[PDB]
């Protein structure tokens, strides 16, 4: 895969924002996709169970869990349900937060 062309202007027309020159000090990190996209996806089970998966996370995910659920709680009035997989390096959350989590990981610049 081509390393994507450095531009003068960010974000780009299609909305692509590069991760920063430094990385934050938060005790966890998110590898961008092999496409340099933020590894947040949506997935369903049994057709009715809606889920949101954060991927490729290196560090204490527990912290990431804290921060994510604390970001989402004002939105739903209540903590959203969470499943942490420590060996997978993966986070899972009930409902579709795809759009908002995309933004929230553009915030911290992962």
């Amino acid at each position: 895969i081509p390393r994507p062309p450095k531009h003068e202007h960010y974000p780009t027309p299609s909305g692509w924002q590069p991760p920063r020159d430094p990385a934050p000090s938060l005790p966890y990190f998110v590898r961008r996709s092999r496409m340099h996209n933020i590894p947040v996806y949506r997935d369903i089970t049994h057709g009715n169970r809606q889920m949101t998966v954060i991927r490729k996370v290196e560090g204490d995910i527990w912290a990431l869990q804290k921060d994510v659920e604390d970001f989402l709680s004002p939105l739903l009035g209540k903590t959203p349900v969470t499943q942490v997989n420590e060996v997978t390096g993966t986070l899972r959350v009930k409902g579709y937060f795809d759009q908002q989590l995309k933004a929230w990981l553009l915030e911290k610049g992962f």
Binding site: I1, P2, R3, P4, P5, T12, P13, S14, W16, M35, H36, E58, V87
Partner: protein
């Protein structure tokens, strides 16, 4: 990094001796033995089912079968011969130029869209190429040369506004194949055949400057194209004055599959050598 690492200093060797697959990976099979799952083994009692013969799937027990009461209809009728065109949104296109998969600099036809893995064509399945849609219409900032098999008005518009040139070109099943996975066609080691002309019904679509059809009269190109701007309300750029002009101008023969090559040729990729016929009948054949 992964503090898990430092937990492995503590523990005994990882070897074959100690291995557990991920819990819930193997959902264990059961076997009709024992008090629970033996004795009729979940096959029920007597009747048909216990003997394993219950009738075929569409069957209602002789009442006229659901799927068979309903009258036939033209539906999937001639489904094999109905042309398909794989869609390409403008949003996806902007995307692909943005991450520099397909670069706008050199010309863009299907092949390039393919190699960036931005689109997938299965010609055997009656796919006659990529077609264009307007999804990122407002999003679209890129100046590009695009050649597709079909496009929609709004799409043509959104490329014009930015100053690129869109051409509607056709490919037959065979030539289209050659187009999409070209390297394996070369390794086939057969000459590079003539391009077909589009079928009769399709003819009017490709003869219109309306679509900027590759077989259309260039005399109407500047006309209908400028028309596009008055309808959609923008100032039409002067392409002839641009630096990238000579690439945007670049066309194919209606007989040419690729850029820079010609019917009749043969590629030897071992010797990195092109081969052209010096025989006359051949040249009359492939150049016609």
């Amino acid at each position: 990094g992964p503090r898990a690492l430092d937990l492995l200093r503590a523990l005994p060797r990882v070897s074959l001796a100690n291995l557990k697959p991920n819990p819930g990976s193997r959902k264990p099979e059961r076997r009709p033995r024992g008090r629970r799952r033996g004795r009729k083994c979940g096959r029920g009692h007597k009747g048909e089912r216990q003997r394993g013969t219950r009738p075929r799937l569409g069957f209602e027990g002789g009442q006229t079968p659901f799927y068979l009461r309903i009258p036939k209809y033209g539906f999937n009728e001639g489904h094999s011969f109905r042309h398909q065109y794989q869609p390409l949104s403008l949003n996806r296109l902007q995307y692909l130029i943005d991450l520099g998969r397909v670069d706008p600099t050199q010309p863009i036809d299907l092949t390039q869209l393919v190699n960036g893995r931005g689109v997938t064509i299965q010609p055997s399945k009656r796919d006659y190429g990529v077609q264009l849609v307007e999804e990122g219409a407002d999003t679209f900032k890129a100046k590009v040369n695009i050649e597709v098999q079909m496009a929609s008005e709004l799409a043509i518009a959104a490329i014009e506004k930015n100053g690129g040139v869109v051409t509607t070109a056709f490919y037959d099943p065979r030539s289209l194949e050659i187009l999409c996975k070209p390297v394996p066609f070369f390794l086939r080691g057969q000459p590079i055949p003539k391009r077909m002309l589009p079928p009769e019904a399709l003819v009017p679509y490709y003869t219109d400057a309306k679509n900027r059809g590759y077989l259309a009269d260039p005399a109407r190109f500047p006309e209908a194209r400028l028309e596009l701007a008055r309808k959609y309300g923008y100032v039409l750029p002067d392409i002839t004055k641009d630096e990238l002009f000579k690439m945007l101008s670049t066309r194919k023969d209606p007989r040419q599959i690729f850029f820079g090559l010609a019917p009749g040729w043969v590629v030897n990729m071992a010797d990195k050598k092109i081969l052209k016929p010096t025989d006359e009948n051949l040249l009359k054949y492939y150049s016609s």
